[PDB]
Amino acid sequence: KPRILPWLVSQLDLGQLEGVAWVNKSRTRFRIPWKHEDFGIFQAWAEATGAYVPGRDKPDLPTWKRNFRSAMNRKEGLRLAEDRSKDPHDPHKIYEFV
Ligand SMILES: [Cl-]
Ligand SMILES: [Cl-]
Ligand SMILES: [Cl-]
Ligand SMILES: [Cl-]
Ligand code: NA
Ligand code: NA
Ligand SMILES: [Zn+2]
Ligand SMILES: [Zn+2]
Ligand SMILES: [Zn+2]
Ligand SMILES: [Zn+2]
């Protein structure tokens, strides 16, 4: 395989992942809960890309967060708009389509 952009836009349109959401009406900007049992977008992406199969691999979140940051930062039309990942209340990042 899947490509990060179409897969991401789909996850966001569906709105089934807690805290993972469009933040503007035009749907060029979105939130990922991010903190420096999750079952969130990092593991979902690992499963979609075959990097994680339950019971085959041991759970590795820091790696999932790394693989996922890597796939996102490489996309030319994706900018990191905001880094709130150290916030105590709701740690998150905002990404934008440029
Ligand atoms: Cl749509
Ligand atoms: Cl998951
Ligand atoms: Cl605050
Ligand atoms: Cl905040
Ligand atoms: Na949400
Ligand atoms: Na996760
Ligand atoms: Zn859409
Ligand atoms: Zn899963
Ligand atoms: Zn924010
Ligand atoms: Zn705060």
Q: Which domains does the chain have, with CATH numbers?
A: 3-98 (1.10.10.10)
Dihedral angle, C-alpha 49, 55, 56, 62, nearest 10 °: 60
Rounded distance from Cα 54 to ligand 2 centre (Å): 10
Rounded distance from Cα 85 to ligand 6 centre (Å): 14
Q: What is the spatial distance between Cα 31 and Cα 62, in angstroms, rounded to a whole number? A: 19
CA distances for 78 relative to 35, 41, 45, 71, 89, angstroms: 20, 17, 17, 10, 26
Ligand nearest to the CA of 22: 5
One-letter amino acid of 90: D
Cβ 53 vs Cβ 47: under 8 Å: yes
| 45: nearest Cα among 88, 11, 79 | 11
Cβ 21 vs Cβ 12: under 8 Å: yes
How far apart are the two ends of the chain, measured CA to CA in Å? 24
Rounded distance from Cα 8 to ligand 7 centre (Å): 10
Task: Name 79's bridge partners.
Answer: 96
Question: The tokens of 66 are what?
Answer: 């790394």
Rounded distance from Cα 5 to ligand 1 centre (Å): 13
